[PDB]
Amino acid sequence: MVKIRLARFGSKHNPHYRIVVTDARRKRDGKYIEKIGYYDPRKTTPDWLKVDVERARYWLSVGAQPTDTARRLLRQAGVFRQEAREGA
């Protein structure tokens, strides 16, 4: 059972979730096997998604199921496929 999703930590200080790899759902405190991505729902500038597609790819490589949100962030972090700046 490996799934990557957003980990809500901030309670009343800074709203930020990480794209971490844990079970289907927390049980008592919430723990993951490792942290591959990071997410920050900030409505200021387009620069809050920070993932290590390499580690985030380790999980997607072990049949890791990313929720619809973390799934759309693994594609944003350039995880499903490499990205480049063609035309130059």
UniProtKB/Swiss-Prot annotation:
Origin superkingdom: Bacteria
**Transmembrane region(s):** none
Q: Which Gene Ontology cellular component terms are annotated?
A: cytoplasm; small ribosomal subunit
Q: Select a single GO molecular function from the record's annotations and give it.
A: structural constituent of ribosome
* UniProt record, GO biological process: translation
Q: Which UniProt keywords apply?
A: Ribonucleoprotein, Ribosomal protein, RNA-binding, rRNA-binding
Q: What does this protein do?
A: Binds to the lower part of the body of the 30S subunit, where it stabilizes two of its domains.
Give the family this protein belongs to, as stated in its UniProt record. Answer: Belongs to the bacterial ribosomal protein bS16 family.
Subunit structure and binding partners:
Part of the 30S ribosomal subunit.
Could you identify this protein by its name? Small ribosomal subunit protein bS16
Provide the organism lineage as a comma list. Bacteria, Thermotogati, Deinococcota, Deinococci, Thermales
